[PDB]
């Protein structure tokens, strides 16, 4: 797997499952790489994994990929290795990686089962754009016999909120595709706003698609509860103050793909570590990284 | 002394026809809960240690319904005694059966089986015991009433009662119903016998929670034509120079109490239960712990059970169960 296969592999892993996240496929590529590396050096593997993660940072431009790379590098190197000839080391590392992958895979379902208790009957959900986590939590909400209307923005650089509305209209829930510049128009009728984030920074703020900040601020001015539903591998060791303080490799005549929402604009988070206030996101994030 | 109660689980009125020809009116559900459960919950919440259920018509069905309830469990604090006979046919027959069986000991609660209430009677029972210790067994019955305006949909035209009470000692001097009478006649010996004040009361909704004494059963076995409660109080208030036995009264202004007698009381009391006027006895509290009756209380008094599956576009605005 001299990096070319890795890029190719990653792609094969992302196109084989369309309902699969990108960072999960990145961690599956890292686990494949460790599984078939053929290097006997407890350190020889760290440099190879770092090069792999920079090829998975170059191929995928998402924040979650680099976050999952750091979390996979920490979680594989956790137990008391004490290897004689790396054989024990590599086997334990592979075991840890598989355990980590399974935890990630059951994370989303945990998110949905822990989050759908906030949607009241007859509520109006406001949603930014397509993410499998908020779609799963809405399918858990409709699984509990609840009736609610969903206004999904379109998110203009790639009309994916329209794709979310297509995938949610098949769920037989009342959905309305709202133009992206109408989030101040429909905030007065949308009582709560559920948005899936793609990256959670240390203070509790979120890194997301370009229209989240204006949506979150419009939710703060109308006192609407802004809920974020994200996994545990989407945590990041960044601390942006402004919208320019996010790194440029996650951003991209001035068409950014990613904004930042302050933790003061966020009511709750729904991670697999629990329903967290943003100061709990800071505590848990530091603890989790370990 | 332990507090006893006599529950008449068969209203001998011909009112729920033909509703009552299948199940007796005491098994009639207000909101998924039969009336006998409401009455037993009121008796157990007031603090009654032993009741005597007296069931005449369709009594085997009441027996099969009430044995599997909460009040016949051995873990229940309020023990019940299901007493059925196909011979008695009126309330006076129930109390003369009580005197013949010698069931009560001291100051029981005579109540019908279809009364919805949450009245804590221990203050009124303390007042009754004080009057029994002061007058040396002269005060016989303490009728419990509730303050209510005559315009309330609870009190209907067949059951509106007007009382005349000495308000300083809270005893009943005159008692009559207003069925078919626009004017009300009060005798004058009431004022000449007691010149320490007198007050008329039309604001009293009858709860039928008459606290009684073993002298009540003595008076019911002493006089055969006393068929029901109003016959007893009307024969006791017109006869003072014989069988003196003055009747007292208690009025509650902070607790709910009403019994069902027709469809009108049924609708009014059910609307009061759904609108939570009888807290704690609310349909989400599940005072009868039946697994098929638990509900969730949403806004506008909407009570929803499990596995309801509301359809799309279904609008429930207020007071839905």
What experimental approach yielded this model?
cryo-EM
CATH at residue A224? 3.40.50.10470
Q: Can you give the residue range of the structural domain that contains A163? A: 110-289
Q: Distance from first CA to last CA of chain A, Å, rounded?
A: 30
Which of A50, A83, A109 is a domain's end point? A109
Q: Verify that A93 and A41 share a domain, yes or no.
A: yes
Half-sphere exposure of A229 (CA within 13 A, CB side): 29
* Contact across the interface for B312 and A147, Cβ inside 8 Å: yes
Q: Verify that A141 and A206 share a domain, yes or no.
A: yes
- The C-alpha of A153 sits at a distance from chain B's nearest C-alpha, in angstroms, of 23
Integer Cα distance of B188 and B320 in angstroms: 51
Q: Verify that A88 and A9 share a domain, yes or no.
A: yes
CB-CB contact of B227 with B91 (8 Å): yes
User: What letter would DSSP give residue B300?
Assistant: G
Q: Verify that A249 and A185 share a domain, yes or no.
A: yes
Which of B296, B310, B314, B317 to substitute to test the interface with A, most A CBs within 10 Å? B310
C-alpha distances in angstroms, B143 versus A207, B127, B176, B187, B246?
Answer: 71, 12, 14, 21, 12
Report the chain B residue with the minimal C-alpha distance to residue A142: B309
Q: Verify that A99 and A120 share a domain, yes or no.
A: no
User: What letter would DSSP give residue B125?
Assistant: H
Which of A88, A109, A130 is a domain's end point? A109
Report the DSSP pairing between strands B50-55 and B4-8: parallel
Q: Does B315 touch chain A (CB under 8 A)?
A: no
Q: Does A122 touch chain B (CB under 8 A)?
A: no
Q: Verify that A188 and A228 share a domain, yes or no.
A: yes
Strands (E), A174-238: 175-178, 192-195, 199-200, 206-208, 226-229
Q: Which two tokens stand for residue B103?
A: 């069931």
Q: Does B291 touch chain A (CB under 8 A)?
A: no
* Contact across the interface for A121 and B298, Cβ inside 8 Å: yes
* Contact across the interface for A147 and B308, Cβ inside 8 Å: no
CB-CB contact of A154 with A177 (8 Å): yes
Number of folded domains in chain A?
Answer: 2
Q: Does A36 touch chain B (CB under 8 A)?
A: no
C-alpha distances in angstroms, A67 versus A53, A70, A232, B75?
Answer: 10, 5, 9, 58
| CATH architecture of residue range(s) B4-275 | Alpha-Beta Complex (3.90)
- The C-alpha of B29 sits at a distance from chain A's nearest C-alpha, in angstroms, of 27
Q: Verify that A99 and A117 share a domain, yes or no.
A: no
CB-CB contact of B9 with B60 (8 Å): no
Q: Does A91 touch chain B (CB under 8 A)?
A: no
Q: Verify that A121 and A259 share a domain, yes or no.
A: yes
Which of A71, A86, A109 is a domain's end point? A109
User: What letter would DSSP give residue B310?
Assistant: P
- The C-alpha of B120 sits at a distance from chain A's nearest C-alpha, in angstroms, of 37
b or e along A215-246 (b: 16 or more beta carbons within 10 Å of the residue's beta carbon)?
A: bbbbbbeeebebbbbbbbbbbbebebeeeeeb
Q: Verify that A95 and A9 share a domain, yes or no.
A: yes
Residues of chain A found within 8 Å of residue B309, distances taken between Cβ atoms: 145
Integer Cα distance of B232 and B236 in angstroms: 6
Q: Does B195 touch chain A (CB under 8 A)?
A: no
Q: Verify that A191 and A102 share a domain, yes or no.
A: no
Q: Verify that A100 and A114 share a domain, yes or no.
A: no
Q: Does A147 touch chain B (CB under 8 A)?
A: yes
């Amino acid at each position: 797997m001299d990096d070319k296969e890795l890029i190719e592999y990653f792609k094969s892993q992302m196109k084989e499952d369309p309902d699969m996240a990108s960072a999960v496929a990145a961690i599956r590529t890292l686990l494949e790489f460790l599984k078939r590396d053929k290097g006997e050096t407890i350190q020889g593997l760290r440099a190879n994994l770092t090069s792999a993660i920079e090829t998975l940072c170059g191929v995928d431009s998402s924040v979650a990929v680099s976050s999952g790379g750091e979390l996979f590098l920490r979680f594989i190197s956790l137990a008391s290795l004490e290897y004689s000839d790396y054989s024990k080391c590599k086997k334990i590392m592979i075991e840890r990686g598989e355990l980590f992958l399974r935890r990630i895979s059951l994370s989303r379902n945990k998110i949905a089962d822990l989050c759908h208790t906030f949607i009241k009957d007859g509520a109006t959900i406001l949603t930014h754009a397509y993410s499998r986590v908020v779609l799963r939590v809405l399918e858990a909400a409709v699984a509990a016999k609840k009736r609610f209307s969903v206004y999904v923005t379109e998110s203009q650089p790639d009309l994916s909120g329209k794709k979310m509305a297509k995938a949610l209209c098949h769920l037989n829930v009342p959905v309305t595709v709202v133009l992206d510049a109408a989030v101040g128009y429909i905030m007065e009728k949308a009582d709560l706003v559920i948005v899936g984030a793609e990256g959670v920074v240390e203070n509790g703020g979120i890194i997301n698609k370009i229209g989240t900040n204006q949506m979150a601020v419009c939710a703060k001015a109308q006192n609407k509860p802004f809920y974020v539903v994200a996994e545990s591998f989407k945590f990041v060791r960044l601390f942006p103050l402004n919208q320019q303080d996010v790194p440029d490799k996650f951003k991209y005549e001035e068409h950014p793909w990613v904004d930042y929402t302050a933790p003061s604009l966020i009511t709750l988070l729904f991670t697999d570590l629990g329903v967290l206030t943003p100061s709990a996101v800071s505590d848990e994030l530091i603890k989790l990284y370990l | 002394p332990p507090l006893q109660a006599v529950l008449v689980a068969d209203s001998f009125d011909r009112r729920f026809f033909p509703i009552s020809k299948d199940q007796p009116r005491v098994l009639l559900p207000l909101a998924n809960v039969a009336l006998i459960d409401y009455t037993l919950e009121f008796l157990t919440a007031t603090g009654v240690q032993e009741t005597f259920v007296f069931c005449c018509w369709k009594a085997a069905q009441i027996k099969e319904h009430l044995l599997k309830s909460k009040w016949c469990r051995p873990t229940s604090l309020n023990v019940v005694r299901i007493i059925t006979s196909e011979l008695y046919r009126s309330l006076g027959d129930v109390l003369r059966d009580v005197d013949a069986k010698a069931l009560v000991r001291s100051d029981f609660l005579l109540v019908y089986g279809d009364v919805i209430s949450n009245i804590n009677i221990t203050r009124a029972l303390e007042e009754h015991r004080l009057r029994r210790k002061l007058e040396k067994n002269v005060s016989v019955m303490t009728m419990i009433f509730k303050e209510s305006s005559p315009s309330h949909p609870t009190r209907c035209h067949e059951d509106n009662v007007v009382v005349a009470v000495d308000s300083t000692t809270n005893r009943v001097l005159h008692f009559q119903k207003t069925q078919g009478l626009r004017r009300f006649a009060f005798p004058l010996s009431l004022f000449q016998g007691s010149s320490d004040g007198v007050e008329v009361r039309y604001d009293l909704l009858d709860c039928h929670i008459s606290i009684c004494s073993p002298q009540v059963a003595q008076l019911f076995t002493d006089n055969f034509d006393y068929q029901t409660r109003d016959d007893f109080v009307r024969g006791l208030l017109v006869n003072e120079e014989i069988l003196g036995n003055q009747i007292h009264m208690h009025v509650t202004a902070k607790e709910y109490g009403a019994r069902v007698s027709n469809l009108h009381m049924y609708s009014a009391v059910c609307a009061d239960v759904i609108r939570r006027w009888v807290y704690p006895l609310t349909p989400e509290a599940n005072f009868t712990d039946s697994t098929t009756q638990s509900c969730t209380h949403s806004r506008h008094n909407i009570y929803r059970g499990p596995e309801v599956s509301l359809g799309h576009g279904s609008i429930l605005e207020e007071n839905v169960l």
